Design a protein around this motif. Structure first.
Motif, PDB file in Angstrom:
ATOM      1  N   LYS D   7      -2.947  -9.724 -39.027  1.00  0.00           N
ATOM      2  CA  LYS D   7      -3.473 -10.414 -37.866  1.00  0.00           C
ATOM      3  C   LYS D   7      -3.229  -9.652 -36.596  1.00  0.00           C
ATOM      4  CE  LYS D   7      -5.231 -14.151 -39.849  1.00  0.00           C
ATOM      5  NZ  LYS D   7      -6.688 -14.389 -39.821  1.00  0.00           N
ATOM      6  N   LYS D   8      -2.076  -8.950 -36.501  1.00  0.00           N
ATOM      7  CA  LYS D   8      -1.771  -8.029 -35.432  1.00  0.00           C
ATOM      8  C   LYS D   8      -2.786  -6.918 -35.327  1.00  0.00           C
ATOM      9  CE  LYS D   8       2.778  -7.073 -36.021  1.00  0.00           C
ATOM     10  NZ  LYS D   8       4.076  -6.691 -35.421  1.00  0.00           N
ATOM     11  N   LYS D  10      -5.784  -6.978 -36.597  1.00  0.00           N
ATOM     12  CA  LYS D  10      -7.098  -7.582 -36.500  1.00  0.00           C
ATOM     13  C   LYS D  10      -7.650  -7.525 -35.097  1.00  0.00           C
ATOM     14  CE  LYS D  10     -10.847  -9.803 -38.079  1.00  0.00           C
ATOM     15  NZ  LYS D  10     -11.798  -9.124 -38.988  1.00  0.00           N
ATOM     16  N   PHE D  11      -6.768  -7.627 -34.078  1.00  0.00           N
ATOM     17  CA  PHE D  11      -7.158  -7.697 -32.689  1.00  0.00           C
ATOM     18  C   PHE D  11      -7.346  -6.319 -32.144  1.00  0.00           C
ATOM     19  CE2 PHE D  11      -4.991 -11.818 -33.131  1.00  0.00           C
ATOM     20  CZ  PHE D  11      -6.141 -12.588 -32.919  1.00  0.00           C
ATOM     21  N   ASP D  14     -10.732  -4.906 -33.177  1.00  0.00           N
ATOM     22  CA  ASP D  14     -11.770  -5.567 -32.410  1.00  0.00           C
ATOM     23  C   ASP D  14     -11.900  -4.958 -31.045  1.00  0.00           C
ATOM     24  OD1 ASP D  14     -12.054  -7.260 -34.578  1.00  0.00           O
ATOM     25  OD2 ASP D  14     -11.264  -9.063 -33.551  1.00  0.00           O
ATOM     26  N   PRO D 203      -9.654 -21.921  -5.700  1.00  0.00           N
ATOM     27  CA  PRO D 203      -8.784 -21.635  -4.561  1.00  0.00           C
ATOM     28  C   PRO D 203      -9.087 -20.309  -3.912  1.00  0.00           C
ATOM     29  CG  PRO D 203      -7.469 -22.615  -6.309  1.00  0.00           C
ATOM     30  CD  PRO D 203      -8.864 -22.352  -6.857  1.00  0.00           C
ATOM     31  N   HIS D 207      -4.957 -15.841   1.478  1.00  0.00           N
ATOM     32  CA  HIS D 207      -4.346 -16.983   2.098  1.00  0.00           C
ATOM     33  C   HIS D 207      -4.955 -18.151   1.405  1.00  0.00           C
ATOM     34  CE1 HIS D 207      -3.785 -13.930   5.263  1.00  0.00           C
ATOM     35  NE2 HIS D 207      -2.802 -14.643   5.778  1.00  0.00           N
ATOM     36  N   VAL D 208      -4.102 -18.952   0.723  1.00  0.00           N
ATOM     37  CA  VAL D 208      -4.551 -19.982  -0.174  1.00  0.00           C
ATOM     38  C   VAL D 208      -4.641 -21.212   0.682  1.00  0.00           C
ATOM     39  CG1 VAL D 208      -4.264 -21.203  -2.331  1.00  0.00           C
ATOM     40  CG2 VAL D 208      -3.327 -18.852  -2.039  1.00  0.00           C
ATOM     41  N   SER D 209      -5.888 -21.674   0.923  1.00  0.00           N
ATOM     42  CA  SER D 209      -6.180 -22.664   1.930  1.00  0.00           C
ATOM     43  C   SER D 209      -5.993 -24.041   1.376  1.00  0.00           C
ATOM     44  CB  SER D 209      -7.626 -22.564   2.467  1.00  0.00           C
ATOM     45  OG  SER D 209      -7.827 -21.307   3.097  1.00  0.00           O
ATOM     46  N   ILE D 210      -5.821 -25.010   2.303  1.00  0.00           N
ATOM     47  CA  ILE D 210      -5.616 -26.398   2.001  1.00  0.00           C
ATOM     48  C   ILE D 210      -6.979 -26.982   2.243  1.00  0.00           C
ATOM     49  CG2 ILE D 210      -4.537 -28.588   2.568  1.00  0.00           C
ATOM     50  CD1 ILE D 210      -2.883 -25.140   3.414  1.00  0.00           C
ATOM     51  N   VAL D 211      -7.613 -27.494   1.161  1.00  0.00           N
ATOM     52  CA  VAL D 211      -8.940 -28.060   1.197  1.00  0.00           C
ATOM     53  C   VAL D 211      -8.791 -29.479   1.658  1.00  0.00           C
ATOM     54  CG1 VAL D 211     -11.049 -28.592  -0.081  1.00  0.00           C
ATOM     55  CG2 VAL D 211      -9.607 -26.582  -0.707  1.00  0.00           C
ATOM     56  N   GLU D 212      -9.454 -29.822   2.788  1.00  0.00           N
ATOM     57  CA  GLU D 212      -9.079 -30.961   3.580  1.00  0.00           C
ATOM     58  C   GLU D 212     -10.311 -31.809   3.820  1.00  0.00           C
ATOM     59  OE1 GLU D 212      -5.768 -31.550   4.870  1.00  0.00           O
ATOM     60  OE2 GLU D 212      -6.812 -33.511   4.955  1.00  0.00           O
ATOM     61  N   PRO D 213     -10.475 -32.969   3.184  1.00  0.00           N
ATOM     62  CA  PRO D 213     -11.511 -33.934   3.526  1.00  0.00           C
ATOM     63  C   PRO D 213     -10.991 -34.811   4.640  1.00  0.00           C
ATOM     64  CG  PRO D 213     -10.349 -34.670   1.528  1.00  0.00           C
ATOM     65  CD  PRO D 213      -9.875 -33.261   1.880  1.00  0.00           C
TER      66      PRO D 213
END
Lengths: 141, 191, 141, 227, 104, 68
Positions: D7-8, D10-11, D14, D203, D207-213
């Motif tokens: 199985k090792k 096998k990849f 591929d 996201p 700079h990972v923003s704060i999605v704000e409704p």
RNA sequence: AACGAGACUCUGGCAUGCUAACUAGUUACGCGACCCCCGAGCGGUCGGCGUCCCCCAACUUCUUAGAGGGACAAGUGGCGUUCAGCCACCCGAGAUUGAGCAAUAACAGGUCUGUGAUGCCCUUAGAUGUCGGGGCUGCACGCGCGCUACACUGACUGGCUCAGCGUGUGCCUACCCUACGCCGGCAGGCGCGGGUAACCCGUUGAACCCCAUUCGUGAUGGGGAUCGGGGAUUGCAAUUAUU
């Protein structure tokens, strides 16, 4: 008692003596020329080392499921000082352990059972627990 | 006794610290008496945290040094059990009071240090913490027994118990009380 | 009615599962007495809770422990950590609060990782050293 | 027809098939606007989806080229006969396909054209198609026999952290001339954050923003209203 | 007849794996095939620790790469027909499946 | 130590207090769950920070007026 | 306003909460078998020791891996413009467990002997493209990275007792890991069997350490360099000594 209860340093030193009284163990001729493992640099001081090692053989069979000549050596093997080269582990002798186990089997304290290994006879298991209480009788556990 | 451990046989009661200066960095009996000297391996992650752990354990720690003996703390405890045993037979005391005197008598009263002027060596005398005294005194006497048994027929246990006697009653036959007085003799000169 | 509560302790990957099952006295480990667990110089340490709390807390249980992992040393701390907590759990479940609250104050006084566990395990090595911090020698000529 | 490998292993095998193909194709379909593949084994059949922008030049008249390609694979990796089945695919939105954008710039350059005006022309397309930003490098010789570098940059870019794996794609292509080799590299930043395909995650990268409704009203006064 | 048929899944992506397992456990439990849950096996590490520098020069550096495979298997006991029918369909991602005749 | 809050926290913290002033308590856990519902913060550790600063601001807003 | 910092990814540390397991365990009996009275009793039974028996038993604490929760300077006391923060303490896992990723611009740094990457120049049949043999190991000397030692906190000979990350034939073209039985002092030989691998090797029955003998301050039994003779294994071949 079970052999679990007592000290094991004491166990062997009475079990080794027990055997040698009873005329038990037909020993190999080679016993005074034998290094005893590949990782030693000398023969044992002991002159009755064979009697001592047969004690330790039969004990381990009581605990674990029993195994052949290979496994006994792996239990006994230690460190090999190769001098200027770094130390490494290695296994000891085989042909000694092959005489030990066949000598026990002559007395029917062990026997070749199923599942790839000798196992200790009920007569053997009787004799262990018999002298196990003799240890407690002696000193006082 | 049933609520406070001994040492396996040695009372931590009838043990005193005979200075007011060096107590609160020498303690052994407030509740800090235990059957054995060992720890789970917390001893230091703060400066104050060092102080708390016993004196008897500290002695065992500083005994294993110089390469081949590092990481063999169980072998080290063998030497300490014989030490107290030999001290008790040899003189006859609560053998911890021996050790407490031996530590207090070996700690320096004044010490020197370096100071840089004109690119040439000049020295200045300064004082020393109680925590410094304890650390130094534990170092010094352990060097003695290590040194003596390096070619002597005598074992390190025998050497160490001798070294605590000559420290506990000053007599200048120890490596400690010698080396203590060397420092103070310097500290007088340059001051 | 059957009463059985189990606990474990750990230190440095040494697990020790100590079940407290109703009974009387007779604490064991691996089906052997705790009196002979083998460095026999740290013998006062695993005994410490039993000796300090008295043997009259251990008069309604049979405790047996199974272990695995760690070295000779770390196992000793594991079996101590488990039996301390095992006793507690038996009181936590079948007896009232004020019995075990008392016992908690005693142990945690001389805490030595009896009721808590170190989070410290080995750090992972990176290249350019034989250790995780120590480095190979650097030469300029 | 058996047994079958670990199985090792096998990849690994591929991965070797996935990779070899992906460089085999790039040396033939370069002029046809190659953009990748996506393999899929299916029940008793292989699918090899040969992604390129212009399926026209890939197909050929009477499907000659697709027939050549299927017969190749049928002999080369020792496939069981008739199991292999090719398919083509056209991608929509071609300016997020860095691999094709870089290899198009190559033939524009190797066609014989100036570098500055070529770099600008490819830039505004990948910006227009949608992209936070984009970058081009050309390292090698020009105007003498010492090398230089020429950066053309617009918009946003990222360079650090785990977002580099998602929100950019990067391509490298060598192009020859009569004097040495020139290195092309193209780096383009994917813009999706509201939704879909979903391809790259919603996201924001660097700079990972704060999605704000927002909602905020009250007109309440006490009354009882029976239902 | 009713044979203990084992549907082994194997993958490298934890999302792609797990949801395809869920589909087969719903569709099985829906038809009351007395399905037995996933048995998650230890995830295995392929490690490759090799030079980061071709033609070694400069400060000595290396690079750890890793691949994580995943195995897990759901054991069914039901007729082999409806299993081999429903199994091979309804798989979107590149995730492998291996059907076994019997194991228990 | 260290751990001085960045501007990404202080920008959105102010905003979230202005438009959802009513929803706020002064407990950590309640102010966390509100920020989780009135917005999505794409990390978990980031969420635990923005709540704590929203809490720390709301202490001072119940005194004299803040200038931010 | 943008890039780097941070955020992010991986890893460690906290779950008797959740999810589920004869390719993972535990507990419970059903047990019947072995064992010793070892303790109350008599040997039975009750208790103790492991193994076989285990199920259509019960469970998932331990083991495994998934979904989630938890730590935020959160609370308190000081300090700070009372701002940004800093120090101590409670709870407890304390705001730092360790790695991965990393900007602008530059270097005449390394690599044409990784490249069917590549310019130019050279060579191309008396070849710079193939077989046989020798060399890269050759020493009056200089330097660097390391290994083993100079002993009694030791060496030596017996005895006891603990682990983890991995890896393994069906691959390259001829090849794996080994249990068990037999023969040999040993290296090793020989007969059988398993393993696509949480399934077989391997409940990885490792070392230091631990326990008991012997040696005695002596270049000693510390040290094992140098060197003679002999026996095995790999290979087509072992000499300048393959192991």
């Amino acid at each position: 008692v079970t052999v679990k209860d007592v000290n094991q340093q004491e166990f062997v030193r009475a079990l080794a003596a027990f055997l040698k009284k009873s005329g038990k163990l037909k020993v190999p001729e080679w016993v005074d020329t034998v290094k005893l493992a590949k990782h030693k640099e000398l023969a044992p001081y002991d002159e009755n080392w064979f009697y001592t090692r047969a004690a330790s053989t039969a004990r381990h069979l009581y605990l674990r499921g029993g195994a052949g000549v290979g496994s006994m050596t792996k239990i006994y093997g230690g460190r090999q000082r190769n001098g200027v080269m770094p130390s490494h582990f290695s296994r000891g002798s085989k042909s000694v352990a092959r005489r030990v186990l066949q000598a026990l089997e002559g007395l029917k304290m062990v026997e070749k059972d199923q599942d790839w290994g000798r196992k200790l006879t009920p007569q053997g298991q009787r004799d262990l627990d018999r002298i196990a209480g003799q240890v407690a009788a002696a000193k006082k556990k | 006794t049933p609520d406070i451990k001994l040492f396996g046989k040695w009372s931590t009661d009838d043990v005193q610290i005979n200075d007011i200066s060096l107590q609160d960095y020498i303690a052994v009996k407030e509740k800090y008496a235990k059957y054995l000297p060992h720890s789970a391996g917390r001893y230091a992650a703060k400066r104050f945290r060092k102080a708390q752990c016993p004196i008897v354990e500290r002695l065992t720690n500083s005994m294993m040094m110089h390469g081949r003996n590092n990481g063999k703390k169980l072998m080290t405890v063998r030497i300490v059990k014989h030490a107290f045993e030999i001290i008790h037979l040899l003189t006859g005391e609560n053998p911890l009071q021996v050790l407490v005197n031996a530590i207090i008598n070996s700690g320096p009263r004044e010490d020197s240090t370096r100071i840089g002027r004109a690119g040439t060596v000049r020295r200045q005398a300064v004082d020393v913490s109680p925590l410094r005294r304890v650390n130094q005194a534990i170092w010094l006497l352990c060097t003695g027994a290590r040194e003596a048994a390096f070619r002597n027929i005598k074992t390190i246990a025998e050497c160490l118990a001798d070294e605590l006697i000559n420290a506990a009653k000053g007599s200048s036959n120890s490596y400690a009380i010698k080396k203590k007085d060397e420092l103070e003799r310097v500290a007088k000169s340059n001051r | 009615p059957l009463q059985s509560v189990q606990v474990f302790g750990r230190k440095k990957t040494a697990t020790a599962v100590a079940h407290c099952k109703r009974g009387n006295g007779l604490i064991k480990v691996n089906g052997r007495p705790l009196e002979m667990i083998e460095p026999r110089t740290l013998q006062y340490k695993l005994l410490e809770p039993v000796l300090l709390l008295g043997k009259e807390r251990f008069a309604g249980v049979d405790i047996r422990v199974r272990v695995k992992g760690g070295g000779h040393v770390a196992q000793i701390y594991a079996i101590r950590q488990s039996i301390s907590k095992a006793l507690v759990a038996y009181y936590q479940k079948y007896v009232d609060e004020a019995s075990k609250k008392e016992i908690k104050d005693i142990l945690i006084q001389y805490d030595r990782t009896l009721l808590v566990a170190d989070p410290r395990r080995c750090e992972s090595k990176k290249f350019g050293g034989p250790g995780a911090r120590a480095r190979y020698q650097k030469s300029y000529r | 027809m058996a047994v079958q490998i670990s199985k090792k292993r096998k990849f690994v095998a591929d991965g070797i098939f996935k990779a070899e193909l992906n460089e085999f194709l790039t040396r033939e379909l370069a002029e046809d606007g190659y953009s990748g593949v996506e393999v899929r084994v299916t029940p008793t059949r292989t699918e090899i989806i040969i992604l390129a922008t212009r399926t026209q030049n890939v197909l050929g008249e009477k499907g000659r080229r697709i027939r050549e390609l299927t017969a190749v694979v049928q002999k080369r990796f020792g496939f069981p006969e008739g199991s292999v089945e090719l398919y083509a695919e056209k991608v929509a939105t071609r300016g997020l396909c860095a691999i094709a954008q870089a290899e198009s710039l190559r033939y524009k350059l190797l066609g014989g054209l100036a570098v500055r005006r070529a770099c600008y022309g490819v830039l505004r397309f990948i910006m227009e198609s949608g992209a936070k930003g984009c970058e081009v490098v050309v390292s090698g010789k020009l105007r003498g026999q010492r090398a230089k570098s020429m950066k053309f940059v617009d918009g946003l870019m990222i360079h650090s952290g785990d977002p580099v794996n998602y929100y950019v794609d990067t391509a490298v292509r060598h192009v020859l001339l009569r004097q040495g080799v020139l290195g092309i590299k193209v780096k383009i930043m994917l813009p999706w954050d509201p939704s879909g395909k979903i391809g790259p995650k919603k996201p924001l990268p660097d700079h990972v923003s704060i999605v704000e409704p927002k909602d905020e009203i009250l007109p309440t006064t006490p009354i009882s209203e029976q239902k | 007849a009713i044979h203990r048929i084992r549907i082994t899944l194997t993958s490298r992506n934890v999302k792609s794996l797990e949801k395809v397992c869920a589909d087969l456990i719903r569709g099985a439990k829906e038809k009351n095939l007395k399905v037995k849950g996933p048995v998650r096996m230890p995830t295995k590490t392929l490690r490759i620790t090799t030079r980061k520098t071709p033609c070694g020069e400069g400060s000595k550096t290396w690079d750890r790469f890793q691949m994580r495979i995943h195995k897990r298997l759901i054991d069914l006991h039901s007729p082999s027909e409806i299993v081999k029918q429903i199994t091979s369909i309804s798989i979107e991602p590149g995730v492998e499946v291996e059907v076994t005749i019997a194991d228990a | 130590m260290g751990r001085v809050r960045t501007k990404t926290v202080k920008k959105a913290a102010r905003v979230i207090i202005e438009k959802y002033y009513t929803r706020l308590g002064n407990d950590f856990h309640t102010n966390k769950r509100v920020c989780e519902e009135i917005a999505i913060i794409p990390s978990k550790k980031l969420r635990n920070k923005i709540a704590g600063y929203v809490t720390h601001l709301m202490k001072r807003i119940q005194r004299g007026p803040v200038r931010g």
